[PDB]
Design a protein around this ligand. Sequence first.
Ligand code: NI
Length: 341
Amino acid sequence: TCPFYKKIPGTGFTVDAFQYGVVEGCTAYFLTHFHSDHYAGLSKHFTFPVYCSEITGNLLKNKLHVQEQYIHPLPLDTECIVNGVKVVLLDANHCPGAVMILFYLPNGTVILHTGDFRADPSMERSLLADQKVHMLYLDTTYCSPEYTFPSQQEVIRFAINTAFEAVTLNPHALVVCGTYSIGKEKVFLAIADVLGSKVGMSQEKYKTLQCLNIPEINSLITTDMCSSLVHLLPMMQINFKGLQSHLKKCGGKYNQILAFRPTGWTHSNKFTRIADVIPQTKGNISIYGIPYSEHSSYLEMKRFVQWLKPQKIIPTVNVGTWKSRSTMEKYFREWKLEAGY
Ligand code: NI
């Protein structure tokens, strides 16, 4: 059954709750972003109102075939009325089209639902600055102090420098980047830009990218593999067997592959810096795991929450075990005692 952490009290709303069938008493289903664990259950046969960003709405229509009459896109940073309740959508700094949602309850309570987010100080100057938030439904993916990671900017600088050096030393080297969802587009776009190439990909992934309102996108991507020296493949194909295979397919146009695997966190984050990363190398193939995250680090999370000073926190991630739940509740209390709310 639908868990309590997906229901917004005092409303007939649910958030990211599409795999339970009809939810008794739901008059509007919000969708924070187009990642499969969040939209799981949506299809062309859905007949209830879905509220979301413009970009998520483009993906629901073109990739899922949800019918236009059930998709209600809203602009960001704008007070809107939905079924009699004032809401605002804010940029979540996650993947394209990902939002946080502010609900203004008839009783005066204000609730923020982060969806999936990477907290940033710029959020402290959004419409969140303007009033008190009583309850926070929080993306707690990396809620433990071991989780450190570098800025997105640092990671992109590393990738750009690594690729440019390799291809300038060997003009017959191929760059490959893995993907399995939207998100992390900066990795493959930044590498292609330094190499004076478009990025080449499959027809299904090009279609996906043409939904995302990225400026000048026609100048940046293509379905013609042969013309391009940065290719995208399914993350499942980013390994030696999969890459050797792929290298054959270009027909001796390339003699070396340099591949990136954008992970979230991995335990080499605890012992190594970005300046000191190394790849796995079998022959003329090298695979780099780069810690490009679209979720808050523990310190970014903690800063956000200490700034917001909510009355109550409801975790939406790692909630399945008593041990995780208890650990999270301990950090929340530390934070509140340190900051004095
Ligand atoms: Ni996500």
